[PDB]
């Protein structure tokens, strides 16, 4: 009896919350992201009998990254020269080479434009890909840039090229980060190997659709994550461990040519073409790909106990989802992937190479917004990049009869980062509490 209040201080205990986070950059920096904050020495401590829950669909920092990436891009591109004076009527006879149907933009379109001394116009010419051009009404010889009817077009600064430098986050004073490490976690539910860290590991701001590439890899066997409020999910994430390699190339040699727009900012385009004309392509090892698909199918049936499973190519929409989209070197790509998904199944080491034929277009839009088309300058020479994939984004039709079907999508840029920040949940510490005891003053 006669227990009296004792007030301990600093006791470890936390509650849910959401807060701004610091971002740290690598020591050998890019030359808030450019030079600092500095790079720490990461640490990780394992804890006994720690009980905690996670929810990869609600965790805060996923939203924050969306603001960070777009804000960084705008901060970087804001001062670069606008292209507004370039947007005028074009004349595009364009039949001056032995083969033109592949591109249809040629040298020798031509258009009037301003030059150094301002008050006298000049005539020039350069190349374009028809996917960046549209035809005006009536006269089939007049053309306009696609996005100029609605927006201004900004040109990437020629001396600058942002690229996927990894970024990792550090909680501010008072908050702590929990990680979880169970290797069969579905992305929602309790963990039994909780842990705490100084900061998160590296994450790249990679952009792609129909699959996420150049990213990290899983630990155990393939995993499938989804929401569970209703079967009618938006986007199902499948996470690989077995890395499947991929290559792509742009054989032709592009020649760089330029115009300069008094008040003195340069503009770039594509000029002469060198070498024999060909189409860009990529390669894949059928054995590895089909084995991976087999494993996915044999894991995929767990949520769908008994129906047949069949894959079919995406359907409809702008090119940002009908095809695979990714960038190497500083130019963008679009690749039809019908052949890589026309398969089926039912219940109960480099031979056979596959090839896929792609296209490249210049003018791009940030994958949701309107009114901010980015224009890239052509890269002279030829480009080739090795790469490897780690996961896929699957959405499902209406399930009919004894069969079920999936198809590739993922146009929302939110999901990509949802697939690499499923680990962390940020909480605040409450260093004050109370308890009873019996000590007496004795003053």
């Amino acid at each position, epitope marked *: 009896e006669n227990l009296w209040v004792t007030v301990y201080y600093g006791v470890p205990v936390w509650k849910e919350a959401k807060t701004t986070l610091f971002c740290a950059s690598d020591a050998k920096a890019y030359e808030t992201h450019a030079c600092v904050p500095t790079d720490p020495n990461p640490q990780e401590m394992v804890l006994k009998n720690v009980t905690e829950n996670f929810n990869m*669909w609600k965790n805060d920092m996923v939203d924050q990254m969306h603001e960070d990436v777009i804000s960084l891009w705008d901060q970087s591109l804001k001062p670069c020269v606008k292209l507004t004076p370039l947007c005028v009527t074009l004349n595009c006879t364009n039949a001056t080479a032995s083969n033109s149907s592949i591109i249809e933009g040629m040298k020798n379109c031509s258009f009037n434009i301003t030059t150094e001394l301002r008050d006298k116009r000049e005539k020039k010419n350069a190349l374009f890909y028809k996917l960046d051009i549209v035809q005006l009404d009536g006269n089939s010889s007049q053309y306009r840039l696609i996005n100029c009817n609605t927006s201004v077009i900004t040109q990437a600064c020629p001396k600058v090229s942002f690229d996927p430098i990894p970024i990792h986050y550090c909680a501010p004073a008072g908050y702590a980060i929990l990680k979880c490490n169970n290797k069969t976690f579905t992305g929602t539910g309790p963990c039994n190997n909780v842990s705490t860290v100084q900061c998160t590991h590296g994450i790249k701001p990679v952009v792609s659709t129909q699959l996420l590439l150049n990213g990290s890899l899983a630990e155990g066997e393939i995993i499938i994550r989804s*929401e569970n409020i209703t079967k009618n999910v*938006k986007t199902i994430i499948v996470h690989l461990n077995e890395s499947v390699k991929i290559e792509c190339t742009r054989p032709n040699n592009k020649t760089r040519t330029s115009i300069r727009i008094g008040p003195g900012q340069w503009f770039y385009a594509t000029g002469q073409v060198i070498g024999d004309i060909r189409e860009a392509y990529c390669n894949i090892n059928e054995s590895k790909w089909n084995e991976t698909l087999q494993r996915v199918s044999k894991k995929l049936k767990e949520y769908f106990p008994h129906k047949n499973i069949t894959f079919q190519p995406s*359907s409809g929409g*702008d090119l940002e989802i009908t095809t695979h989209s990714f960038n190497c070197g500083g130019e963008f790509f679009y690749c039809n992937t019908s052949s890589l998904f026309n398969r089926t199944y039912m219940a109960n080491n480099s031979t056979r190479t596959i090839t896929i034929h792609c296209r490249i277009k210049q003018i791009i839009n940030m994958w949701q917004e*309107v009114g901010r088309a980015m224009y890239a300058p052509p890269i002279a020479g030829n480009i080739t990049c090795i790469s490897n994939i780690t996961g896929l984004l699957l959405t499902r039709d*209406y399930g009919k009869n004894n069969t079920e079907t999936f198809r590739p*999508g993922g146009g*929302n840029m939110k999901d990509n980062w949802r697939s690499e920040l499923y680990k962390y949940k940020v909480v605040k510490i409450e260093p004050l509490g109370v308890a009873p005891t019996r000590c007496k003053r004795r003053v």
Partner: nanobody, 113 residues
């Protein structure tokens, strides 16, 4: 406050192609789906398919994948529907409805048109 108005429709000749349309109002165009639902007179409803405005993905009911067609144009917040080879049994009303949704799941409809 939020509205969804329709144009077109009217009578059509048998076996002919037909069009409809919705015009969005200033709630937000990139943050919600859109559905099409039709109602034969004195019959229970049924759904056709849903078109996202973000990127343009369609998805069709199993009974009409040969005949329907969707596409959008974000520049003016507009959505067009193409229906090919009308049959006598398609005579009905057509609506145009919004659909709340979270980052990972869909839910009820709220603002019919």
């Amino acid at each position: 406050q939020v509205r969804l108005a329709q144009y077109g429709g009217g009578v059509k000749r048998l076996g002919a192609t037909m069009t409809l349309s919705c015009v969005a109002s200033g709630y937000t165009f990139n943050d919600y789906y859109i559905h099409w639902v039709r109602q034969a007179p004195g019959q229970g409803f049924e759904l056709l398919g849903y078109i996202d405005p973000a990127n343009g993905r369609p998805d069709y009911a199993g009974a009409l994948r040969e005949r329907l067609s969707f596409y959008r144009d974000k520049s003016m917040e507009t959505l067009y529907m193409d229906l090919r080879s009308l049959r006598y049994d398609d005579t009905a009303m057509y609506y145009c409805v919004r659909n709340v949704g979270t980052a990972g799941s869909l839910l009820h409809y709220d603002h019919w048109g």
